[PDB]
């Protein structure tokens, strides 16, 4: 029954007649050998824990970034453009939490197979760049925000400029972008992982390259598999 | 406060559109009631 089903060069799954069976293989366009169980950090926990983990307030002094983790800790309080950037990040995280908790996974399950193991990449960066010791980081907050935002628009599953292509591309990477935003959060990067500029750029490039390597190859006989 | 003002403006516009659509709907309700009375 499934012998003549093959993934084509436009990403669709079709039979010998050219009839479309799936508009994207696996609804994500990924290979079955390239995914691993990972936890999405915005789904579980309480609202207090979520707020404590992700919210960064530059006005209140006891609910801000620690002063020993950043070299620019002095001229950071009181900014409004940066506070607007942080608020935009937090609103995006809240939208992701609402989406995952209400539409995708309603019973609270958060351990699902996804590509690009982020924990392994983060610990590899820590080992390579010697991110131990209490040394302050030179990684500015707008750099973090813009790096993550740009990374979330270079995960190409489909190529093209058509609006339908862009809509399908945005649909195909929703869960993975939620995972990336949940991990590479500003407070998490600055306090839990303690990345610097070089480590951050290495992590972004590695995520992009590994996501490119996890896509299914045209010509696969996925029906027989 | 600017965001609240924009939200109030959008709510007022939506309310005006709803009022106009209700005014349009009442004529259809009256015509349907008259035709159902004619059927009886």
């Amino acid at each position: 029954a499934l012998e003549d089903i093959m993934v084509h060069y436009d990403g669709t799954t079709r039979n010998s007649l050219g009839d479309i069976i799936q508009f994207l293989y696996g609804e994500d366009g990924l290979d079955g050998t390239q995914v691993e169980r990972q936890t999405i950090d915005t789904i579980p926990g309480s609202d207090k824990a979520f707020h404590k983990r992700y919210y960064v307030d530059l006005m209140d002094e006891k609910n801000s970034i620690k002063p020993d983790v950043i070299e620019y800790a002095a001229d950071i309080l009181g900014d409004v453009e940066l506070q607007k950037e942080l608020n935009s990040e937090y609103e995006q995280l809240v939208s992701d939490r609402k989406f995952l908790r209400e539409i995708v996974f309603v019973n609270g399950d958060h351990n699902w197979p996804l590509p690009v193991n982020l924990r392994r990449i983060i610990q590899n960066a820590q080992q390579i760049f010697h991110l131990d010791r209490a040394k302050a980081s030179d990684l500015t907050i707008p750099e973090i925000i813009h790096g993550v935002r740009d990374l979330c628009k270079k995960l190409f599953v489909l190529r093209g400029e058509n609006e339908l292509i862009k809509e399908a591309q945005q649909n195909a990477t929703s869960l993975f972008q939620c995972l990336v935003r949940a991990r590479l959060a500003t407070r998490r990067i600055l306090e839990e992982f303690r990345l610097n500029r070089d480590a951050f750029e290495w992590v972004l490039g590695t995520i992009e390259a590994q996501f490119q390597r996890s896509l299914v190859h045209p010509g696969e006989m996925v029906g027989v598999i | 406060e600017k965001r609240l003002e924009q939200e109030q403006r959008r709510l007022e516009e939506a309310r005006k559109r709803q009022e106009a659509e209700l005014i349009k709907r009442q004529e259809l309700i009256k015509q349907a009631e008259e035709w159902n009375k004619m059927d009886i």
Binding site: L2, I5, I21, Q22, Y25, S46, V222 | -
Partner: protein
């Protein structure tokens, strides 16, 4: 209704199918040529209390215990018989307090006709319930729901699992959550809910079968299978009747069967 046991039992009783044959215990045919009196001495008091066509008499003895267990009233059964039979049969029923619960009948060579009427009555008198739902069970379901603090906490709720399927009628019963009723037959799902719900139900059944013994299969394989099985707008079986009724080449189809 999901967190209360009594309302759940009320719904269960209202859903389960109950026929006359279930509560009936024995049926008898008696000869009595007096319309206003009777020969039987045990029932003479009750029938004369009531009073204060053909000679053939039809009285049936119903089990009290199972009639009370199903939570049924004799008047209800009398109205059901009256509705299905109009005025063609005169009906009387002993009250609740009677030692043996009985309900007689009189027609208005007819012994065989009365026998056929009794057999038909035993066969297809539906007292209450959805036809096709033979039995109903009460089940407790552990469901994880977020709290008011956002934390996920387990919970317990009541639900019904039946034997036999009638999705359309059970979905319309008041007290039933009509937006979540599920059937393990996806042909009925296709007839009631459409082809996308059929795809989801087919995946759920295949996942159940695979995952029961602890095995794990990646989602994309079963997704591709159910997408092939539902791509034509109807259910396509993995058989010669499904595969070989396609528009594929003759050489490709002949090599299967």
């Amino acid at each position: 209704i999901a967190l209360d046991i009594e309302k759940a039992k009320v719904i269960q009783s209202s859903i389960e199918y109950t026929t006359l044959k279930n509560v009936t215990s024995a049926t008898e045919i008696y000869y009595d040529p007096d319309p206003t009196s009777t020969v039987i001495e045990e029932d003479f008091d009750t029938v004369e209390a009531y009073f204060s066509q053909s000679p053939w008499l039809l009285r049936l003895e119903l089990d009290r215990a199972r009639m009370l267990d199903k939570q049924l009233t004799m008047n209800q059964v009398a109205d059901k018989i009256s509705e299905v039979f109009s005025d063609d049969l005169f009906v009387m029923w002993s009250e609740d307090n009677a030692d043996k619960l009985i309900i007689r009948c009189r027609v208005i060579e007819e012994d065989q006709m009365l026998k056929r009427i009794e057999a038909h009555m035993l066969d297809l008198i539906a007292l209450r319930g959805i036809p096709g739902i033979s039995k109903v069970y009460m089940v407790k379901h552990k469901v994880s729901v977020p709290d008011e603090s956002g934390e996920y906490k387990n919970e317990e709720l009541w639900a019904l699992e039946t034997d036999g399927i009638n999705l359309a009628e059970v979905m319309a019963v008041p007290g039933v959550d009509s937006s979540r009723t599920y059937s393990n037959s996806f042909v009925e799902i296709l007839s009631v809910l459409g082809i996308e719900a059929t795809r989801s139900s087919l995946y759920k059944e295949i996942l159940n079968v695979i995952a029961f013994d602890g095995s794990y299969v990646n989602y994309r394989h079963m997704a591709l299978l159910v997408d092939v099985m539902t791509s034509r707008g109807y259910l396509m079986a993995i058989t010669r009747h499904g595969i070989n009724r396609a528009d594929t080449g003759a050489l490709m189809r002949c090599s299967f069967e």
